[PDB]
Amino acid sequence: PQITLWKRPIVTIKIGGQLREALLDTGADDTVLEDIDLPGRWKPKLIGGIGGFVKVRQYEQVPIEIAGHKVVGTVLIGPTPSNIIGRNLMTQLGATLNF
Amino acid sequence: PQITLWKRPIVTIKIGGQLREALLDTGADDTVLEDIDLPGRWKPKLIGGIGGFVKVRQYEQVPIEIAGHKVVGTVLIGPTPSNIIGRNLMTQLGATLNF
Ligand SMILES: CC(C)CN(C[C@@H](O)[C@H](Cc1ccccc1)NC(=O)O[C@H]1CCOC1)S(=O)(=O)c1ccc(N)cc1
């Protein structure tokens, strides 16, 4: 698809058999989800945004479906006011910004 | 232009006779710049990001050039680890996300 930016670029995701929504976020290097429990081993990691920093669980080689496209990559789990898909996964969709 | 997302989508801006760089940020509703002082009246505003909240100055009807395109709109000034161009201004470029 091609979408305009008059509203937030929210898409449907499926991860670990759970369905959620997430914001396509060209400002975010990495994907961050709050409302999802993932199984298996993880690494503690601190991410920085506007206002300060949050402790996140880093999960690697996570299968995730984004707007219908199966990819596998790194998903961070921790507090975020919005689930965000970052460039780590948007590059696997071949996503582009156009203006 | 069309850009891919293997690197951060950074563009050159000109605002108030000052040249800066900023991130094209589909995850950001509003534009936020740190490293620039703007003239005239403003309104206090609090914005929320991943890591809490910051106090910003809201400046309205600010002339700004983004990757060569003159627009006028609202610019928030306050602490941000990266200057960000949000959807408020990217909609004036006719920007789209494609995948
Ligand atoms: C340069 C920063 C700002 C990058 N952030 C992404 C931005 O899109 C961020 C995403 C977000 C959406 C909803 C609520 C809160 C935050 N929008 C944001 O703060 O919107 C504010 C600023 C004005 O408009 C509102 S991040 O979330 O800190 C981040 C950082 C690192 C990683 N790996 C992942 C995410």
UniProtKB/Swiss-Prot annotation, chains A, B:
Per the record, which residues fall in region Dimerization of protease?
Answer: 1-5, 49-55, 88-99
Which residues are catalytic?
25 (for protease activity)
Which residue intervals define the domain Peptidase A2 in the entry?
Answer: 20-89
Q: How does it assemble?
A: Homodimer, whose active site consists of two apposed aspartic acid residues.
This protein is called Protease
Q: Which organism is it from?
A: Human immunodeficiency virus type 1 group M subtype B (isolate BRU/LAI) (HIV-1)
Gene that this polypeptide is encoded by: gag-pol
| Range of the intact protein held here | 501 to 599 of 1447
